[PDB]
Design a protein around this ligand. Sequence first.
Ligand SMILES: *[C@@H]1O[C@H](CO[C@@H]2O[C@@H](C)[C@@H](O)[C@@H](O)[C@@H]2O)[C@@H](O[C@@H]2O[C@H](CO)[C@@H](O[C@@H]3O[C@H](CO)[C@@H](O)[C@H](O)[C@@H]3O)[C@H](O)[C@H]2NC(C)=O)[C@H](O)[C@H]1NC(C)=O
Ligand SMILES: Cc1ccc([C@H]2CC[C@@H](C(=O)O)N2C(=O)CN[C@@H](CCc2ccccc2)C(=O)O)cc1
Ligand SMILES: *[C@@H]1O[C@H](CO)[C@@H](O[C@@H]2O[C@H](CO)[C@@H](O)[C@H](O)[C@H]2NC(C)=O)[C@H](O)[C@H]1NC(C)=O
Ligand SMILES: *[C@@H]1O[C@H](CO[C@@H]2O[C@@H](C)[C@@H](O)[C@@H](O)[C@@H]2O)[C@@H](O)[C@H](O)[C@H]1NC(C)=O
Ligand SMILES: [Cl-]
Ligand SMILES: [Mg+2]
Ligand SMILES: [Zn+2]
Length: 606
Amino acid sequence: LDPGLQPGQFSADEAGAQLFAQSYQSSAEQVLFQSVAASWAHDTNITAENARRQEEAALLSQEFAEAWGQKAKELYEPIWQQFTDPQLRRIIGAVRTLGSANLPLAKRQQYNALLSQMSRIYSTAKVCLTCWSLDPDLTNILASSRSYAMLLFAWEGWHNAAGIPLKPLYEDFTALSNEAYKQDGFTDTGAYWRSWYNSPTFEDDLEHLYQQLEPLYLNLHAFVRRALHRRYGDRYINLRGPIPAHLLGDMWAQSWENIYDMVVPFPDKPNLDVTSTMLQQGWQATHMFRVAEEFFTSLELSPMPPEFWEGSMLEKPADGREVVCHASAWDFYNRKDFRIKQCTRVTMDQLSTVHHEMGHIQYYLQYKDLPVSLRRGANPGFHEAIGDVLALSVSTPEHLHKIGLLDRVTNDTESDINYLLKMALEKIAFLPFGYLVDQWRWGVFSGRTPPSRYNFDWWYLRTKYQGICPPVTRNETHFDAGAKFHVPNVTPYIRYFVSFVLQFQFHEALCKEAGYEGPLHQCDIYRSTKAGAKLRKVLRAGSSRPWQEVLKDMVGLDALDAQPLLKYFQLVTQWLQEQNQQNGEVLGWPEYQWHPPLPDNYPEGI
Ligand SMILES: *[C@@H]1O[C@H](CO[C@@H]2O[C@@H](C)[C@@H](O)[C@@H](O)[C@@H]2O)[C@@H](O[C@@H]2O[C@H](CO)[C@@H](O[C@@H]3O[C@H](CO)[C@@H](O)[C@H](O)[C@@H]3O)[C@H](O)[C@H]2NC(C)=O)[C@H](O)[C@H]1NC(C)=O
Ligand SMILES: Cc1ccc([C@H]2CC[C@@H](C(=O)O)N2C(=O)CN[C@@H](CCc2ccccc2)C(=O)O)cc1
Ligand SMILES: *[C@@H]1O[C@H](CO)[C@@H](O[C@@H]2O[C@H](CO)[C@@H](O)[C@H](O)[C@H]2NC(C)=O)[C@H](O)[C@H]1NC(C)=O
Ligand SMILES: *[C@@H]1O[C@H](CO[C@@H]2O[C@@H](C)[C@@H](O)[C@@H](O)[C@@H]2O)[C@@H](O)[C@H](O)[C@H]1NC(C)=O
Ligand SMILES: [Cl-]
Ligand SMILES: [Mg+2]
Ligand SMILES: [Zn+2]
């Protein structure tokens, strides 16, 4: 560790802890920048040399974290919890969490190499027939193809190509991660991840939320299953069993927006999937980001700085260079460089992804002047909700008309059901998946799910919550959890379940602040500087204050609450209930053992 980055001496009191955090801040930004920069160089250009530089940068970050983390303990272990400054407590509490820096050098290098290799495997995996990449090739097949056998080839090809080689690495990562955080006092890594929500009843609170939401999913599921049955037939769709996991428009069946055309209740109304209009009009990635930016500035939030436009990767490179295509938003911790890395495609759902990622950036811009340790969301779910809240306004037929994507504008009950059904395919359908992913990982980290049950327990949860089944037989050689980005990239997932609930609480509060007095699902906060000011207060707080208090200041309640989401979807919740009853649907999937047969000539005819 360079001398300038090493901790000096500070008094063993709160006045020295303050000077300690100031000196930490000075060197942490440099260490974070070199680490983020090296990660950027690798993720925008996957080479072996760039992976080596990233592992060396990660090793330096661990060296920094060890020195300052061990100094923080040395000086402040028994007095930091009593400091009068609540932000200083949060800073000290963060610095003294060493994580992977607890591992001995050899195991630090193992750990860093595992993260690098898992990242490379996921983002370079391909399905060969010439070969297809996940983004865009297989993504487009899952989204547009309606051939049961073709969707099967892409689904099976991807899960096999990405998951199988990851499993031995993921086992090793899990053990090292647990070893590291056990030295921080946590029973396992999952316990550390859950501690970010500072709620002793976190898992019970989540279970109570899902109990309120599950009936909406069950009715959406039964309605969609009927629509798929009408297209694929009784051989491939069981009206009393789980839906084959490759037929819902998305590689992970986590968003069903892509099958909207098969489920739209009233096709004679305006087409709310504006993808075809974006293409007809010649939209490109840069247009999508500028339209997103202008919504932010309409609220008097910040535009994207020049450093963002000059540094970001907004399309997949056409030099064929290997990149991490999964969309992400980057804080370089130098208060100047902020970037998005996205292999953007011209679709409506990608426009929503752009808003999601730009919401991450807006957070970074608003709290860039806080101490590095507090440059986070009030909790991780806050960070995930910002852009989605704006996208809720953008997707309204009224707003789409304003930006030229929906010429016809209608306000009738049928159009409302169409819109709420489309929104349910994006938001309700995701809820079981957003909930189950970290249930699986918490069980892996705790040891309830050993490697011998990785896939068994994954598909138990997928069926239990999503009511889907794999369309080909799986076994424990397969590692289908590993075929989902966040698992090999070690990104927690419960934040997305939290965000999908939270964003409707935000939406309701900002709509009220904007002076809107109509149906919640028709609210558009576009150009509301009052709504912008309320949102800005959240963003500028970072993690400096307990999220429960930040939430109460914003929405008037100190807890996650499903009522705004239920209120938003009320009309289609009632409509789906009635339709499924009239159609004599079985809610749920009582034939839980059912899997579809293989196509006659599979995979010969692809
Ligand atoms: C789409 O249309 C709905 C429904 O409009 C209402 O019902 C129709 C059958 C007609 O009779 C309309 O004349 C009638 O407004 C609109 O929702 C309605 O918006 C108005 C405000 O624009 C709401 O009235 C306000 O209500 C608050 C109390 O909540 C009062 O303080 C105000 O003084 C004002 O009266 C009305 O409650 C609301 N109705 C519902 C069911 O929410 C909606 O605005 C419209 N949307 C678009 C995008 O055009
Ligand atoms: C339209 C739309 C909106 C939002 C998403 C979000 C929610 C679902 C989840 C998913 O698609 O499963 N999702 C992402 O994954 C996005 N991308 C990660 C990247 C997080 C990351 C952290 C650290 C390092 C690298 C990446 C991020 O922005 O939160 C999807 C689609
Ligand atoms: C991808 O990364 C490699 C580094 O691993 C880059 O290769 C360097 O390119 C510069 C030219 O600007 C040369 O001077 C270096 O000698 C190269 N280094 C190595 C190890 O080959 C490459 O330029 C990157 N590609 C892009 C498009 O940025
Ligand atoms: C696991 O699965 C591997 C390949 O998948 C198999 O392919 C088709 C033909 C069916 O046999 C299906 O049931 C299988 O999933 C096999 O190579 C492997 O031997 C299977 N079992 C084990 C223990 O690895
Ligand atoms: Cl999280
Ligand atoms: Mg789509
Ligand atoms: Zn996000």
